[PDB]
Swiss-Prot record:
Organism: Schizosaccharomyces pombe (strain 972 / ATCC 24843)
Biological role: DNA-binding protein that recognizes sites within both the enhancer and the promoter of rRNA transcription, as well as upstream of many genes transcribed by RNA polymerase II. Has a role in the termination of RNA polymerase I catalyzed transcription.
Signal peptide annotation: none
DNA-binding residues (ranges): 182-204, 235-258
Portion of the full sequence shown: 154 to 500 of 504
Sorted UniProt keywords: DNA-binding, Nucleus, Repeat, Transcription, Transcription regulation
Protein known as: DNA-binding protein reb1
Length: 340
DNA sequence: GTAAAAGGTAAGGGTAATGCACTTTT
DNA sequence: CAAAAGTGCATTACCCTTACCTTTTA
């Protein structure tokens, strides 16, 4: 499910055996991993890893592999032993797994019994004491972080990514029936309460109004209007008001629209409006951006030009006087006069 | 008794992993 | 040509943190 301490130990061991097999050094392997395409035994080795580690893609296995020998750029995929915040280091999870295994062997519990007692509404004194000692052995990290981690990692629910159409529906009806009560709902569906929230907030809440296609000009414009009415930005509320895109989709689209672009001057605005006006005339009453992006070639991305067009429509008085076609032609002509 | 510390639950938040359409390489 | 594999882009799987309660501990 996730890259744990075991997965790193497997990689390192498989790599040590690789070197011994072909009489190679770790420096020689690191040199091969600087190249884009792999060859020979190293190519055969990765193929094995992909098969031996089905929980991960070849792309992500390579990212970890290249990180293991250190290849610049792959630092973020490198092994982490400990941290005070965010993701748990491989040594932290190892300590937890050791403490849980010790606590479970004591008192004679199964790991299933352990998970149920953790999630038994109000945990008993033995569980409360288990937490206390665990916090001391991870004193660097906030005790609440460890508390949330353990619950998520040790649960009685069936953890899986596949939600069916019916299960999605059953969730909906539960929310209609009981409200935003994910613990009550979660137990009814044998699902981790947080997973129920996520399924609802990011998928099922939207119903059939959710879109996967490319954003429309109207959709992108609406997105800009709602961010103007508002940390600073609550993407969950943003998606709710837009109604056709998830919070992460909105968060992503907004970032692309507002990315750092080259300063649009008078001449730059003219070229854009002229390239748009060509698409308005030659093509149907629509804007084909495929040709516009290509002619820009690196200076602006699609979303950046769209962002600029939105602001031009809002600021140029011609767009309040005339329809899109004529207003654009008027906007260009007015832009050409001031250039004198 | 008290106040401090910690559990329980839901809102808020964010990135590595991945799918996809694509080019590139064997 | 098929097939294996790399890659930018948008989405997904999956996780963590904060806020605000109630409950337990000292």
């Amino acid at each position: 499910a996730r890259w744990t301490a075991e997965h790193w130990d497997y990689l390192e061991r498989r790599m040590q055996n690789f070197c011994q097999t072909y009489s190679l050094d770790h420096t020689q392997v690191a040199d091969s991993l600087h190249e884009k395409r792999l060859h020979g035994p190293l190519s055969s080795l990765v193929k094995l890893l992909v098969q031996e580690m089905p929980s991960f893609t070849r792309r992500t296995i390579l990212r970890h592999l290249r990180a293991l020998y250190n290849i610049p750029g792959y630092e973020k995929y490198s092994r982490k032993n400990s941290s005070g915040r965010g993701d748990f280091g491989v040594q932290e999870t190892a300590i937890i797994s050791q403490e849980v295994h010790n606590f479970i062997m004591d008192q004679g519990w199964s790991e299933y019994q352990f998970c149920n007692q953790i999630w038994a509404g109000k945990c008993p004194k033995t569980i409360r004491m288990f937490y206390s000692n665990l916090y001391k052995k991870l004193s660097h990290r906030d005790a609440k972080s460890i508390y949330h981690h353990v619950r998520r990692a040790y649960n009685p629910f069936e953890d899986r990514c596949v939600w069916s159409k019916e299960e999605d529906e059953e969730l909906r009806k539960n929310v209609v029936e009981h409200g935003k009560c994910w613990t009550k709902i979660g137990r009814k569906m044998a699902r981790m309460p947080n997973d129920c929230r996520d399924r609802w907030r990011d998928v099922v809440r939207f119903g059939d109004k959710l879109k996967r296609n490319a954003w429309s000009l109207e959709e992108e414009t609406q997105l800009l209007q709602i961010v103007a009415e508002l940390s600073d930005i609550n993407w969950t509320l943003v998606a709710q008001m837009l109604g056709t895109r998830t919070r992460l989709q909105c968060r992503y689209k907004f970032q692309q629209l507002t990315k750092a672009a080259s300063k649009f001057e008078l001449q730059e605005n003219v070229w854009l409006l002229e390239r748009i006006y060509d698409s308005l005339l030659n093509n149907g009453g629509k804007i084909h951006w495929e040709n516009i992006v290509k002619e820009a070639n690196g200076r602006w991305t699609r979303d950046q030009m769209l962002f600029q067009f939105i602001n031009l429509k809002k600021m140029i008085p011609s767009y309040d006087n005339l329809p899109l076609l004529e207003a654009t032609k008027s906007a260009i002509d007015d832009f050409k006069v001031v250039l004198s």
